[PDB]
Amino acid sequence: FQSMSRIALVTRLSPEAEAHWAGHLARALPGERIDGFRELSPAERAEVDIAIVANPDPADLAELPNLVWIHSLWAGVERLVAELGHLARPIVRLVDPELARTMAEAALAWTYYLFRDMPAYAAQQRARVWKGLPYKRPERTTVGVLGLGELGAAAALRLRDAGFDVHGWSRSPKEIAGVTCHAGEETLERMLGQVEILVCLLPLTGETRGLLDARRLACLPEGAQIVNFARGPILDSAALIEALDSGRIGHAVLDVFEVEPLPEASPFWGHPKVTVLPHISAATDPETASAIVGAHVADYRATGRIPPSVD
Amino acid sequence: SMSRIALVTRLSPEAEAHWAGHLARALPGERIDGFRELSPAERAEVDIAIVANPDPADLAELPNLVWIHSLWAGVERLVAELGHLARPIVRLVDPELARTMAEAALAWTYYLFRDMPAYAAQQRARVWKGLPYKRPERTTVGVLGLGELGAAAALRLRDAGFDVHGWSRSPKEIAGVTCHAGEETLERMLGQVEILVCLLPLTGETRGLLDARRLACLPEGAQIVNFARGPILDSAALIEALDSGRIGHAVLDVFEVEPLPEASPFWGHPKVTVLPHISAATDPETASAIVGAHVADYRATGRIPPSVD
């Protein structure tokens, strides 16, 4: 017999979440043989040359000999490259050309969530309290964006077009029309000082790890609200909790955490001033994500060319 | 001897105080107090009441009252309810209202679209689980009512990328929005709408418009936002549609009794988001100046502004 090729879907998602993906991937890649890792026998595993993954268990990936390369379903594979660099199979991240748009949407939707007092109304609804809160217009409301790369800039422009008084910070100079742009660590504290809602869209490096520490959080106005779409380590967890408790920070929408899935024992889950999101601000719709995986897979079947991978 | 103004509301104390401060700035010459702060002698001095969902019982304790200025745009409830006083009622026509209502339409569409209720429910249960996203362009959003508010709202939604459908009783064309006209087309419109935003005025033709039958026309799991008025929507029918799964969620801002009594089932319902009439939310800075001008003109001329009747 001619030996046969196949694809394993290796995740640690809920079974219904994995099955949702399987269905979409099957649509995008008809004829490929795609199975949940759990469904494959040892013979079938030895046939697998491509793994499509979402937070896979390394133990499962190690049970696939003859594996050639990996396609993540996620955009952020930093967790994965560290966890699995050692398997010496290229890792391909899911790069979606519409990420900036979708992240800018999310910045706006969650700024509105805070601006329009949705959390407070939800809390009051649970206590059966009817109580309208003071409204002021966006134009008298200062919104800060940390990070002015492709995502931060897109986000700032959506916020601007919504009518907010938008301030931007970056390490280098940036000029974005209708947005007051601040440059360098020197101007950061003056920028934080004026901002009622802060949206974080910074990349994680040496110079940004712990950038939002106890000191810097204290620079924000009393009651300021924060949205973290960046990475966990940009923000000092324990310092955020103390600032929340004391009232310095009014509310925090958190999408990114040092450990993900966020462990059950994190105090963030229960915290009254915290909204926890499971790393979805910028997610691709699975139809689009699947079609991109599909195209990459199809190109490898045609050319033997592994797509551009990560270090 | 002198005149004075009473601020008569059933808002939160801090919401009332926010208004008092702004009104005081817009009307420095005047004496303005919260109704509760006035003694019976002082009450007899009051000639103008500035109101927001006032308690009629309070307005009745002001004898020499001449006219009323509402802080709200929709005073239809009030004119009927205060018919027995036969005193002019002046509404707030505020130019910023359309912008602010359109903002709200968008923000709460985003609340539903981005799955915020479900993520909140997961958070309470300590469940980490990303949900499928689909783009706005593949997502149909309906607006009921295409007056000044509904049209503004439709345009914000359109510019957000949503597949926007509009319904009104009269013909109307809004660019980049699929517009439906007349009660005949209503059910075909409801039929393809995933999120429905209600911005209809209360009239004879709209009382009970969203009844059991019409709710059933929506696709399974459709989500609704009611920024219109309580009687547009059949309460008990909504609750049964929520329970059965026909309707996935409902954001409700408007109720015939406000504050919403502690015993309403809407408070404790897991598929309901209750908002305390924040469809009346308006920046008081801007609004106060309009009240101010009206009050000032009456102090100068004795002319009551154009009232409703």
mmCIF file of all heavy atoms in Angstrom, chain A residues 98 105 112 115-116 121 125 128-129 132 135 137-138 140 158 264 269 274 276 281 285, chain B residues 12 103 110 114 123 126 132-133 135-136 156 262 264 267 272-274 276 278 283 285:
data_model
loop_
_atom_site.group_PDB
_atom_site.id
_atom_site.type_symbol
_atom_site.label_atom_id
_atom_site.label_comp_id
_atom_site.label_asym_id
_atom_site.label_seq_id
_atom_site.Cartn_x
_atom_site.Cartn_y
_atom_site.Cartn_z
ATOM 1 N N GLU A 98 -7.120 41.545 8.847
ATOM 2 C CA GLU A 98 -8.125 42.358 9.528
ATOM 3 C C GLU A 98 -7.943 42.510 11.042
ATOM 4 O O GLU A 98 -8.884 42.952 11.740
ATOM 5 C CB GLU A 98 -9.526 41.770 9.278
ATOM 6 C CG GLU A 98 -9.812 41.414 7.809
ATOM 7 C CD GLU A 98 -11.297 41.273 7.534
ATOM 8 O OE1 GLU A 98 -11.890 40.277 8.018
ATOM 9 O OE2 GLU A 98 -11.863 42.171 6.856
ATOM 10 N N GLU A 105 -12.075 47.864 16.752
ATOM 11 C CA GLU A 105 -13.483 47.614 17.177
ATOM 12 C C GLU A 105 -13.572 47.316 18.671
ATOM 13 O O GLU A 105 -14.312 47.986 19.404
ATOM 14 C CB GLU A 105 -14.100 46.499 16.336
ATOM 15 C CG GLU A 105 -15.511 46.083 16.716
ATOM 16 C CD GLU A 105 -15.969 44.886 15.920
ATOM 17 O OE1 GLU A 105 -16.438 45.125 14.763
ATOM 18 O OE2 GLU A 105 -15.829 43.722 16.388
ATOM 19 N N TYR A 112 -16.575 51.921 25.323
ATOM 20 C CA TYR A 112 -18.025 52.224 25.526
ATOM 21 C C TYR A 112 -18.582 51.498 26.743
ATOM 22 O O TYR A 112 -19.297 52.078 27.534
ATOM 23 C CB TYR A 112 -18.843 51.876 24.304
ATOM 24 C CG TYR A 112 -18.917 52.933 23.182
ATOM 25 C CD1 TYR A 112 -19.028 52.536 21.872
ATOM 26 C CD2 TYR A 112 -18.967 54.305 23.439
ATOM 27 C CE1 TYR A 112 -19.151 53.431 20.858
ATOM 28 C CE2 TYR A 112 -19.069 55.230 22.411
ATOM 29 C CZ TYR A 112 -19.190 54.772 21.121
ATOM 30 O OH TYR A 112 -19.297 55.629 20.048
ATOM 31 N N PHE A 115 -17.310 53.677 29.550
ATOM 32 C CA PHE A 115 -17.762 55.047 29.418
ATOM 33 C C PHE A 115 -19.228 55.156 29.748
ATOM 34 O O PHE A 115 -19.644 56.086 30.499
ATOM 35 C CB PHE A 115 -17.476 55.514 28.023
ATOM 36 C CG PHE A 115 -18.075 56.846 27.670
ATOM 37 C CD1 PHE A 115 -17.727 58.028 28.361
ATOM 38 C CD2 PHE A 115 -18.947 56.940 26.607
ATOM 39 C CE1 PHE A 115 -18.252 59.276 28.003
ATOM 40 C CE2 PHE A 115 -19.469 58.177 26.245
ATOM 41 C CZ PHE A 115 -19.137 59.348 26.958
ATOM 42 N N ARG A 116 -20.005 54.213 29.202
ATOM 43 C CA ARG A 116 -21.453 54.152 29.428
ATOM 44 C C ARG A 116 -21.861 53.480 30.730
ATOM 45 O O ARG A 116 -23.028 53.328 30.969
ATOM 46 C CB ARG A 116 -22.155 53.513 28.214
ATOM 47 C CG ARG A 116 -22.033 54.330 26.890
ATOM 48 C CD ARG A 116 -22.453 55.828 27.031
ATOM 49 N NE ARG A 116 -23.834 55.954 27.491
ATOM 50 C CZ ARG A 116 -24.855 56.478 26.806
ATOM 51 N NH1 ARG A 116 -24.719 57.108 25.617
ATOM 52 N NH2 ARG A 116 -26.073 56.408 27.352
ATOM 53 N N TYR A 121 -24.000 49.476 36.195
ATOM 54 C CA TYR A 121 -25.426 49.168 36.025
ATOM 55 C C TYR A 121 -25.679 47.690 36.236
ATOM 56 O O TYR A 121 -26.711 47.289 36.829
ATOM 57 C CB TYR A 121 -25.944 49.661 34.663
ATOM 58 C CG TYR A 121 -25.976 51.208 34.545
ATOM 59 C CD1 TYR A 121 -25.437 51.881 33.445
ATOM 60 C CD2 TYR A 121 -26.594 51.992 35.518
ATOM 61 C CE1 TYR A 121 -25.518 53.267 33.351
ATOM 62 C CE2 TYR A 121 -26.664 53.370 35.410
ATOM 63 C CZ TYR A 121 -26.130 54.008 34.342
ATOM 64 O OH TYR A 121 -26.237 55.408 34.274
ATOM 65 N N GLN A 125 -28.099 46.223 39.028
ATOM 66 C CA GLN A 125 -29.171 45.274 38.615
ATOM 67 C C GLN A 125 -29.203 44.033 39.542
ATOM 68 O O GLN A 125 -30.235 43.736 40.110
ATOM 69 C CB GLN A 125 -29.039 44.842 37.160
ATOM 70 C CG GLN A 125 -29.974 43.681 36.781
ATOM 71 C CD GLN A 125 -29.951 43.277 35.302
ATOM 72 O OE1 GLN A 125 -29.235 43.854 34.502
ATOM 73 N NE2 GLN A 125 -30.778 42.308 34.951
ATOM 74 N N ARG A 128 -30.763 45.084 42.631
ATOM 75 C CA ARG A 128 -32.112 45.609 42.374
ATOM 76 C C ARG A 128 -32.223 47.089 42.724
ATOM 77 O O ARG A 128 -33.200 47.536 43.329
ATOM 78 C CB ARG A 128 -33.186 44.744 43.041
ATOM 79 C CG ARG A 128 -33.108 43.288 42.565
ATOM 80 C CD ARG A 128 -34.015 42.335 43.371
ATOM 81 N NE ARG A 128 -35.199 41.979 42.602
ATOM 82 C CZ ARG A 128 -35.526 40.788 42.098
ATOM 83 N NH1 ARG A 128 -34.786 39.701 42.252
ATOM 84 N NH2 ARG A 128 -36.655 40.724 41.397
ATOM 85 N N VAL A 129 -31.189 47.824 42.317
ATOM 86 C CA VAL A 129 -31.018 49.230 42.591
ATOM 87 C C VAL A 129 -31.230 49.953 41.272
ATOM 88 O O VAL A 129 -30.555 49.673 40.301
ATOM 89 C CB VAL A 129 -29.573 49.524 43.086
ATOM 90 C CG1 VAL A 129 -29.231 51.024 43.119
ATOM 91 C CG2 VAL A 129 -29.353 48.915 44.451
ATOM 92 N N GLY A 132 -29.647 55.911 37.747
ATOM 93 C CA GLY A 132 -28.944 56.620 36.718
ATOM 94 C C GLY A 132 -27.716 57.356 37.211
ATOM 95 O O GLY A 132 -27.758 58.030 38.245
ATOM 96 N N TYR A 135 -23.919 61.585 33.113
ATOM 97 C CA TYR A 135 -23.388 61.469 31.741
ATOM 98 C C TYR A 135 -22.653 62.758 31.390
ATOM 99 O O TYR A 135 -23.131 63.855 31.652
ATOM 100 C CB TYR A 135 -24.503 61.248 30.718
ATOM 101 C CG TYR A 135 -23.999 61.110 29.295
ATOM 102 C CD1 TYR A 135 -23.517 59.881 28.815
ATOM 103 C CD2 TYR A 135 -23.986 62.210 28.415
ATOM 104 C CE1 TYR A 135 -23.031 59.769 27.502
ATOM 105 C CE2 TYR A 135 -23.512 62.097 27.099
ATOM 106 C CZ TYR A 135 -23.048 60.879 26.636
ATOM 107 O OH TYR A 135 -22.556 60.769 25.350
ATOM 108 N N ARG A 137 -20.341 64.133 27.808
ATOM 109 C CA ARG A 137 -20.129 63.772 26.420
ATOM 110 C C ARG A 137 -18.705 63.288 26.167
ATOM 111 O O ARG A 137 -17.824 63.512 27.000
ATOM 112 C CB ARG A 137 -20.616 64.869 25.467
ATOM 113 C CG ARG A 137 -19.880 66.188 25.507
ATOM 114 C CD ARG A 137 -20.796 67.301 25.001
ATOM 115 N NE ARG A 137 -20.018 68.511 24.896
ATOM 116 C CZ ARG A 137 -19.748 69.341 25.903
ATOM 117 N NH1 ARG A 137 -20.224 69.128 27.143
ATOM 118 N NH2 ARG A 137 -19.009 70.421 25.654
ATOM 119 N N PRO A 138 -18.487 62.486 25.094
ATOM 120 C CA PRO A 138 -17.150 61.947 24.773
ATOM 121 C C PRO A 138 -16.061 62.984 24.633
ATOM 122 O O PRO A 138 -14.895 62.718 24.923
ATOM 123 C CB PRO A 138 -17.360 61.281 23.389
ATOM 124 C CG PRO A 138 -18.791 60.975 23.316
ATOM 125 C CD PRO A 138 -19.486 62.055 24.092
ATOM 126 N N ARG A 140 -15.645 65.647 26.234
ATOM 127 C CA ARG A 140 -15.109 66.069 27.516
ATOM 128 C C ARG A 140 -14.548 64.866 28.251
ATOM 129 O O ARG A 140 -14.340 64.912 29.449
ATOM 130 C CB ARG A 140 -16.193 66.700 28.396
ATOM 131 C CG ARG A 140 -16.858 67.934 27.841
ATOM 132 C CD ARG A 140 -17.496 68.714 29.018
ATOM 133 N NE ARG A 140 -18.743 68.141 29.608
ATOM 134 C CZ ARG A 140 -19.165 68.262 30.895
ATOM 135 N NH1 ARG A 140 -18.428 68.888 31.806
ATOM 136 N NH2 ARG A 140 -20.350 67.733 31.295
ATOM 137 N N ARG A 158 -10.343 54.945 15.716
ATOM 138 C CA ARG A 158 -11.752 54.631 15.973
ATOM 139 C C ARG A 158 -12.238 55.499 17.124
ATOM 140 O O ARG A 158 -13.350 56.013 17.074
ATOM 141 C CB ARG A 158 -12.029 53.165 16.336
ATOM 142 C CG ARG A 158 -12.044 52.144 15.207
ATOM 143 C CD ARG A 158 -13.032 52.323 14.076
ATOM 144 N NE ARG A 158 -14.443 52.418 14.489
ATOM 145 C CZ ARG A 158 -15.288 51.410 14.722
ATOM 146 N NH1 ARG A 158 -14.889 50.133 14.637
ATOM 147 N NH2 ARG A 158 -16.551 51.677 15.070
ATOM 148 N N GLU A 264 -8.415 29.099 38.066
ATOM 149 C CA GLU A 264 -9.643 29.259 38.882
ATOM 150 C C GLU A 264 -9.433 30.090 40.157
ATOM 151 O O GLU A 264 -10.351 30.782 40.599
ATOM 152 C CB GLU A 264 -10.205 27.871 39.278
ATOM 153 C CG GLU A 264 -11.639 27.828 39.908
ATOM 154 C CD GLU A 264 -11.666 28.064 41.448
ATOM 155 O OE1 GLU A 264 -10.668 27.622 42.098
ATOM 156 O OE2 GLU A 264 -12.662 28.676 42.010
ATOM 157 N N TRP A 269 -11.194 36.738 38.846
ATOM 158 C CA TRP A 269 -12.500 36.182 38.506
ATOM 159 C C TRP A 269 -13.613 36.793 39.377
ATOM 160 O O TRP A 269 -14.603 37.313 38.890
ATOM 161 C CB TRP A 269 -12.491 34.694 38.712
ATOM 162 C CG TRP A 269 -11.708 33.881 37.743
ATOM 163 C CD1 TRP A 269 -10.574 33.176 38.000
ATOM 164 C CD2 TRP A 269 -12.049 33.620 36.378
ATOM 165 N NE1 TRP A 269 -10.183 32.507 36.876
ATOM 166 C CE2 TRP A 269 -11.061 32.764 35.861
ATOM 167 C CE3 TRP A 269 -13.073 34.050 35.547
ATOM 168 C CZ2 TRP A 269 -11.074 32.304 34.566
ATOM 169 C CZ3 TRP A 269 -13.079 33.592 34.213
ATOM 170 C CH2 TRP A 269 -12.100 32.714 33.751
ATOM 171 N N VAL A 274 -13.499 44.088 38.352
ATOM 172 C CA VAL A 274 -12.772 43.509 37.239
ATOM 173 C C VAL A 274 -13.720 42.816 36.270
ATOM 174 O O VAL A 274 -14.489 41.969 36.656
ATOM 175 C CB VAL A 274 -11.676 42.507 37.711
ATOM 176 C CG1 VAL A 274 -11.046 41.809 36.495
ATOM 177 C CG2 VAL A 274 -10.609 43.203 38.517
ATOM 178 N N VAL A 276 -13.280 40.057 33.357
ATOM 179 C CA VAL A 276 -12.334 39.093 32.778
ATOM 180 C C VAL A 276 -12.831 38.662 31.394
ATOM 181 O O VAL A 276 -13.979 38.211 31.263
ATOM 182 C CB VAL A 276 -12.180 37.850 33.649
ATOM 183 C CG1 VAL A 276 -11.372 36.773 32.949
ATOM 184 C CG2 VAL A 276 -11.488 38.197 34.981
ATOM 185 N N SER A 281 -10.054 39.782 22.483
ATOM 186 C CA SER A 281 -10.295 41.150 21.911
ATOM 187 C C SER A 281 -10.155 41.149 20.365
ATOM 188 O O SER A 281 -11.057 41.589 19.585
ATOM 189 C CB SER A 281 -9.373 42.207 22.542
ATOM 190 O OG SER A 281 -8.126 41.667 22.875
ATOM 191 N N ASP A 285 -12.660 35.469 13.193
ATOM 192 C CA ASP A 285 -13.805 34.576 13.054
ATOM 193 C C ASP A 285 -13.279 33.230 12.480
ATOM 194 O O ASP A 285 -12.338 33.214 11.678
ATOM 195 C CB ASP A 285 -14.926 35.178 12.192
ATOM 196 C CG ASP A 285 -14.534 35.328 10.778
ATOM 197 O OD1 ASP A 285 -13.699 36.240 10.497
ATOM 198 O OD2 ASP A 285 -15.039 34.532 9.956
ATOM 199 N N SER B 12 -31.534 59.516 41.019
ATOM 200 C CA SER B 12 -30.640 59.288 42.152
ATOM 201 C C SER B 12 -30.273 60.674 42.705
ATOM 202 O O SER B 12 -30.285 61.634 41.942
ATOM 203 C CB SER B 12 -29.382 58.522 41.716
ATOM 204 O OG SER B 12 -28.487 59.375 41.003
ATOM 205 N N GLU B 103 -25.025 56.966 19.797
ATOM 206 C CA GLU B 103 -23.945 56.395 20.624
ATOM 207 C C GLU B 103 -24.433 55.172 21.431
ATOM 208 O O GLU B 103 -23.865 54.078 21.330
ATOM 209 C CB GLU B 103 -23.358 57.477 21.567
ATOM 210 C CG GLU B 103 -22.299 57.048 22.480
ATOM 211 C CD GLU B 103 -21.875 58.202 23.387
ATOM 212 O OE1 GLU B 103 -21.052 59.007 22.919
ATOM 213 O OE2 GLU B 103 -22.310 58.270 24.566
ATOM 214 N N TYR B 110 -22.969 46.767 20.542
ATOM 215 C CA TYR B 110 -21.652 46.136 20.759
ATOM 216 C C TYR B 110 -21.680 45.222 21.977
ATOM 217 O O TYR B 110 -21.166 44.108 21.967
ATOM 218 C CB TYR B 110 -20.553 47.166 20.930
ATOM 219 C CG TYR B 110 -19.898 47.685 19.680
ATOM 220 C CD1 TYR B 110 -19.470 49.008 19.615
ATOM 221 C CD2 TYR B 110 -19.698 46.884 18.535
ATOM 222 C CE1 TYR B 110 -18.766 49.506 18.512
ATOM 223 C CE2 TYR B 110 -19.040 47.393 17.414
ATOM 224 C CZ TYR B 110 -18.575 48.708 17.410
ATOM 225 O OH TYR B 110 -17.944 49.255 16.327
ATOM 226 N N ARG B 114 -20.612 41.605 20.822
ATOM 227 C CA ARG B 114 -19.369 41.089 21.329
ATOM 228 C C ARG B 114 -19.529 40.066 22.429
ATOM 229 O O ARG B 114 -18.524 39.690 23.015
ATOM 230 C CB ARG B 114 -18.439 42.258 21.768
ATOM 231 C CG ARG B 114 -17.935 43.148 20.606
ATOM 232 C CD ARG B 114 -17.291 42.394 19.499
ATOM 233 N NE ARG B 114 -16.146 41.684 20.001
ATOM 234 C CZ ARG B 114 -14.855 41.872 19.637
ATOM 235 N NH1 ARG B 114 -14.468 42.769 18.698
ATOM 236 N NH2 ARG B 114 -13.917 41.123 20.216
ATOM 237 N N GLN B 123 -17.545 34.368 33.534
ATOM 238 C CA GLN B 123 -16.667 34.905 34.562
ATOM 239 C C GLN B 123 -17.154 34.551 35.954
ATOM 240 O O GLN B 123 -16.393 34.001 36.729
ATOM 241 C CB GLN B 123 -16.454 36.422 34.412
ATOM 242 C CG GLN B 123 -15.690 37.049 35.621
ATOM 243 C CD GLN B 123 -15.419 38.525 35.498
ATOM 244 O OE1 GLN B 123 -15.776 39.172 34.501
ATOM 245 N NE2 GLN B 123 -14.819 39.097 36.563
ATOM 246 N N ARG B 126 -16.372 31.090 36.592
ATOM 247 C CA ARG B 126 -14.920 30.857 36.521
ATOM 248 C C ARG B 126 -14.575 29.914 35.397
ATOM 249 O O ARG B 126 -13.737 29.029 35.548
ATOM 250 C CB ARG B 126 -14.363 30.436 37.884
ATOM 251 C CG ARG B 126 -14.683 31.495 38.940
ATOM 252 C CD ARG B 126 -13.814 31.456 40.137
ATOM 253 N NE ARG B 126 -14.095 32.581 41.032
ATOM 254 C CZ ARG B 126 -13.564 32.745 42.253
ATOM 255 N NH1 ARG B 126 -12.723 31.843 42.798
ATOM 256 N NH2 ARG B 126 -13.918 33.824 42.953
ATOM 257 N N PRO B 132 -17.181 31.977 19.474
ATOM 258 C CA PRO B 132 -17.021 32.311 18.056
ATOM 259 C C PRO B 132 -17.373 33.770 17.757
ATOM 260 O O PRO B 132 -18.429 34.257 18.176
ATOM 261 C CB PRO B 132 -18.013 31.380 17.367
ATOM 262 C CG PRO B 132 -18.136 30.210 18.289
ATOM 263 C CD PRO B 132 -18.092 30.830 19.654
ATOM 264 N N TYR B 133 -16.479 34.450 17.054
ATOM 265 C CA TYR B 133 -16.733 35.786 16.539
ATOM 266 C C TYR B 133 -17.226 35.701 15.082
ATOM 267 O O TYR B 133 -16.700 34.875 14.333
ATOM 268 C CB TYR B 133 -15.427 36.553 16.570
ATOM 269 C CG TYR B 133 -15.499 37.983 16.005
ATOM 270 C CD1 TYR B 133 -15.993 39.027 16.768
ATOM 271 C CD2 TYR B 133 -14.996 38.284 14.743
ATOM 272 C CE1 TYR B 133 -16.030 40.338 16.286
ATOM 273 C CE2 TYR B 133 -15.057 39.590 14.245
ATOM 274 C CZ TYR B 133 -15.573 40.604 15.018
ATOM 275 O OH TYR B 133 -15.640 41.876 14.519
ATOM 276 N N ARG B 135 -18.037 38.684 11.818
ATOM 277 C CA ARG B 135 -17.846 40.095 11.555
ATOM 278 C C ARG B 135 -19.142 40.846 11.560
ATOM 279 O O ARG B 135 -20.166 40.236 11.325
ATOM 280 C CB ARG B 135 -17.117 40.277 10.254
ATOM 281 C CG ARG B 135 -15.735 39.661 10.345
ATOM 282 C CD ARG B 135 -14.863 39.803 9.110
ATOM 283 N NE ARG B 135 -15.282 38.862 8.085
ATOM 284 C CZ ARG B 135 -16.192 39.122 7.152
ATOM 285 N NH1 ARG B 135 -16.803 40.317 7.069
ATOM 286 N NH2 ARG B 135 -16.489 38.157 6.284
ATOM 287 N N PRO B 136 -19.097 42.171 11.800
ATOM 288 C CA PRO B 136 -20.301 42.997 11.682
ATOM 289 C C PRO B 136 -21.049 42.937 10.336
ATOM 290 O O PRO B 136 -22.288 43.037 10.305
ATOM 291 C CB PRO B 136 -19.766 44.427 11.837
ATOM 292 C CG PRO B 136 -18.471 44.292 12.511
ATOM 293 C CD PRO B 136 -17.903 43.006 12.032
ATOM 294 N N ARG B 156 -24.873 55.358 12.653
ATOM 295 C CA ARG B 156 -23.723 54.957 13.477
ATOM 296 C C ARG B 156 -23.483 53.456 13.257
ATOM 297 O O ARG B 156 -22.357 53.047 13.104
ATOM 298 C CB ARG B 156 -23.912 55.173 14.973
ATOM 299 C CG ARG B 156 -23.740 56.595 15.504
ATOM 300 C CD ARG B 156 -22.401 57.299 15.269
ATOM 301 N NE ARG B 156 -21.234 56.555 15.753
ATOM 302 C CZ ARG B 156 -20.747 56.573 17.003
ATOM 303 N NH1 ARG B 156 -21.336 57.275 17.986
ATOM 304 N NH2 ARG B 156 -19.631 55.887 17.268
ATOM 305 N N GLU B 262 -38.621 46.920 42.905
ATOM 306 C CA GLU B 262 -37.799 45.786 43.369
ATOM 307 C C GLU B 262 -38.375 44.383 42.964
ATOM 308 O O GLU B 262 -37.622 43.450 42.666
ATOM 309 C CB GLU B 262 -37.570 45.917 44.898
ATOM 310 C CG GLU B 262 -36.576 46.991 45.342
ATOM 311 C CD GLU B 262 -36.464 47.159 46.888
ATOM 312 O OE1 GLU B 262 -37.518 47.218 47.584
ATOM 313 O OE2 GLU B 262 -35.324 47.237 47.439
ATOM 314 N N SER B 264 -40.037 43.629 40.146
ATOM 315 C CA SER B 264 -40.091 43.274 38.722
ATOM 316 C C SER B 264 -39.276 42.011 38.506
ATOM 317 O O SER B 264 -38.205 41.910 39.046
ATOM 318 C CB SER B 264 -39.588 44.400 37.805
ATOM 319 O OG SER B 264 -39.586 43.955 36.445
ATOM 320 N N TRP B 267 -35.435 42.326 36.915
ATOM 321 C CA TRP B 267 -34.211 42.441 37.690
ATOM 322 C C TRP B 267 -33.416 41.111 37.770
ATOM 323 O O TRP B 267 -32.212 41.047 37.427
ATOM 324 C CB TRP B 267 -34.485 42.878 39.117
ATOM 325 C CG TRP B 267 -34.918 44.287 39.318
ATOM 326 C CD1 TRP B 267 -36.148 44.704 39.713
ATOM 327 C CD2 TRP B 267 -34.132 45.457 39.153
ATOM 328 N NE1 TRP B 267 -36.184 46.062 39.786
ATOM 329 C CE2 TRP B 267 -34.951 46.548 39.452
ATOM 330 C CE3 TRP B 267 -32.823 45.691 38.762
ATOM 331 C CZ2 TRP B 267 -34.492 47.866 39.420
ATOM 332 C CZ3 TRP B 267 -32.371 47.009 38.683
ATOM 333 C CH2 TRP B 267 -33.199 48.077 39.046
ATOM 334 N N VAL B 272 -31.827 39.072 30.865
ATOM 335 C CA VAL B 272 -32.195 40.470 30.810
ATOM 336 C C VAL B 272 -31.134 41.411 31.412
ATOM 337 O O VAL B 272 -30.698 41.213 32.542
ATOM 338 C CB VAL B 272 -33.530 40.727 31.540
ATOM 339 C CG1 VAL B 272 -33.842 42.231 31.566
ATOM 340 C CG2 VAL B 272 -34.661 39.986 30.832
ATOM 341 N N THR B 273 -30.796 42.469 30.675
ATOM 342 C CA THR B 273 -29.978 43.560 31.202
ATOM 343 C C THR B 273 -30.916 44.748 31.423
ATOM 344 O O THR B 273 -31.571 45.217 30.490
ATOM 345 C CB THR B 273 -28.853 43.930 30.216
ATOM 346 O OG1 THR B 273 -27.977 42.805 30.071
ATOM 347 C CG2 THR B 273 -28.033 45.184 30.666
ATOM 348 N N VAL B 274 -30.979 45.212 32.677
ATOM 349 C CA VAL B 274 -31.814 46.337 33.070
ATOM 350 C C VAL B 274 -30.916 47.581 33.145
ATOM 351 O O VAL B 274 -29.940 47.584 33.870
ATOM 352 C CB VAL B 274 -32.483 46.100 34.425
ATOM 353 C CG1 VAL B 274 -33.139 47.357 34.968
ATOM 354 C CG2 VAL B 274 -33.539 45.000 34.326
ATOM 355 N N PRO B 276 -31.283 51.913 33.910
ATOM 356 C CA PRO B 276 -32.247 52.819 34.517
ATOM 357 C C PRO B 276 -32.584 54.067 33.697
ATOM 358 O O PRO B 276 -32.284 55.173 34.109
ATOM 359 C CB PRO B 276 -31.584 53.161 35.852
ATOM 360 C CG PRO B 276 -30.130 53.129 35.545
ATOM 361 C CD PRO B 276 -29.957 52.020 34.556
ATOM 362 N N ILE B 278 -31.365 55.281 30.856
ATOM 363 C CA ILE B 278 -30.191 56.033 30.426
ATOM 364 C C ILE B 278 -30.327 56.414 28.969
ATOM 365 O O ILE B 278 -29.400 56.966 28.417
ATOM 366 C CB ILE B 278 -28.867 55.285 30.729
ATOM 367 C CG1 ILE B 278 -28.776 53.889 30.133
ATOM 368 C CG2 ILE B 278 -28.672 55.179 32.225
ATOM 369 C CD1 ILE B 278 -28.831 53.812 28.611
ATOM 370 N N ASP B 283 -25.894 65.324 28.260
ATOM 371 C CA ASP B 283 -24.921 66.120 28.965
ATOM 372 C C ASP B 283 -25.655 67.372 29.473
ATOM 373 O O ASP B 283 -26.152 68.180 28.671
ATOM 374 C CB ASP B 283 -23.735 66.490 28.086
ATOM 375 C CG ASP B 283 -22.569 67.102 28.884
ATOM 376 O OD1 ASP B 283 -22.752 68.000 29.732
ATOM 377 O OD2 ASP B 283 -21.426 66.684 28.677
ATOM 378 N N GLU B 285 -24.668 70.075 30.860
ATOM 379 C CA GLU B 285 -24.032 71.318 30.463
ATOM 380 C C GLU B 285 -24.762 71.912 29.261
ATOM 381 O O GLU B 285 -25.344 72.988 29.345
ATOM 382 C CB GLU B 285 -22.568 71.081 30.146
ATOM 383 C CG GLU B 285 -21.691 72.296 30.337
ATOM 384 C CD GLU B 285 -20.367 72.216 29.578
ATOM 385 O OE1 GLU B 285 -19.608 71.218 29.733
ATOM 386 O OE2 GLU B 285 -20.098 73.185 28.837
#
